[PDB]
């Protein structure tokens, strides 16, 4: 997160850290807990490290420097990448992760609600992106979970800033005209959430974008409302 501040306990209790353990253990991506056994993330997180054995999922966590061998983590039982997602590309950038064991909810660890059937055409006005990603371009993984408020833009607007790629109806974009606040590397896979009728909803998954926090250069997110039939089929 660029231009953000620190989060608190219970503030974003769906936020997870997807980490790889090879010779070293590192945070690679965010994700969102959407049920006892289910995390929603970005398909691209597995583009370089497709093997589910090597991943560790941390939930109910604010600080990455808290992690030790005894910090409990979830493991992956199944990865479900969208059938039409293409390695290295922007479309259908979404993946379900079934955990090996169901997690119980606590005040620090609970699910985000998915967009409801009635809100297909809702114009969300109070949106937030969270994660442990760089605080600038070519920067560094941050320790304490960062948050930032970012307005959505139209797809026509988003498209004017990405001349060499197609922004589809299955994407949504967010940013400020003069930049300054944005996700960045290491945030990808995590939530974009908006509060609507007093209830938080997962509107986006952090997907792709050009640099971080640049003026006239909004980040791109997988638009979750358009994958709801796919999510319900795959999880039911």
């Amino acid at each position, epitope marked *: 997160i660029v231009g953000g501040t620190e989060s608190s306990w219970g503030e974003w209790p769906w936020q997870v850290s997807l980490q790889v353990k090879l010779t070293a253990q590192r945070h690679l991506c965010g994700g969102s807990l959407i049920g006892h056994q289910w995390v929603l993330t970005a398909a691209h997180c597995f*583009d370089g490290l497709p093997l589910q054995d090597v991943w560790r999922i941390y939930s109910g966590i604010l600080e990455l420097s808290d992690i030790t061998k005894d910090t409990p983590f979830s493991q992956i039982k199944e990865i479900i990448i969208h059938q039409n997602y293409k390695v*290295s590309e922007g479309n259908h950038d979404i993946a379900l992760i079934k955990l090996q064991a169901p997690l119980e909810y606590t005040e620090f660890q609970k699910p985000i609600s998915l967009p409801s059937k009635g809100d297909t055409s809702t114009i969300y006005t109070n949106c937030w992106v969270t994660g442990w990603g760089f605080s600038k371009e070519k920067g560094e993984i941050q320790n304490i979970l960062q948050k930032v408020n970012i307005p959505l833009v139209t797809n026509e607007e988003c498209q004017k800033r990405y001349q060499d790629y197609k922004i589809t109806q299955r994407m949504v974009c967010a940013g400020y005209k003069e930049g300054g606040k944005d996700a960045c590397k290491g945030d990808s896979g995590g939530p974009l959430v908006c509060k609507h009728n007093g209830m938080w909803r997962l509107v986006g998954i952090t997907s792709w974008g050009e*640099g971080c926090a640049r003026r006239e250069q909004p980040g791109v997110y997988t638009k979750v409302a358009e994958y709801m039939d796919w999510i319900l089929e795959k999880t039911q």
Partner: antibody
Amino acid sequence: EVQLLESGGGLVQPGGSLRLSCAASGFTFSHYIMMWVRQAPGKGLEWVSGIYSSGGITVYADSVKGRFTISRDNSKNTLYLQMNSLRAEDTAVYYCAYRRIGVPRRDEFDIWGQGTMVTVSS
Amino acid sequence: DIQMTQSPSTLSASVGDRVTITCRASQSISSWLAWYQQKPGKAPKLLIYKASTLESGVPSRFSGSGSGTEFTLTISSLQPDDFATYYCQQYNTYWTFGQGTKVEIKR
């Protein structure tokens, strides 16, 4: 970030052979086209050879077609340039470079090595 | 084949000046043009790609424009770190570099 480290350059007789290696380290979400570019003393950058995927298209500048062979060994996270039938004018610093395939994911388009020196002389 | 021609070969400027370098392709390459900075004995660093897009972590004083056969790299306010040789590169088909432009300190 991903870092590239070249090795294997050195002194060789004309008509001799040399294998350059380029070793990549780090975590990435990207896949890469992989290139060799060289720079002769006091001269401009010259593109030499490329490989678009693990077992994909390999291509060569005309100035080296038939003599050089580019390859990868993913188990070693390494890119190779097998140089045969070397000539005095192949004397240069040889750089490896990675180029990001697909959409920008808050990350880098190019990654370059440090370069390794190749001297062809009788 | 595709020939790239940069100009000028060398140029002299001061900290704070606006600098402009041009690159011409012998045939259209659409927007597949990248610009690079190189210091003596060091690897080149990418500044700009797809003719006008800044690469990750490159300061916004670097900008690029053009399409087809004619491209310019602009440095809005030259800094000390900016004295170096600059290369263009078409990547329409393989890679081809221009012969380079040296940006030297004026006095």
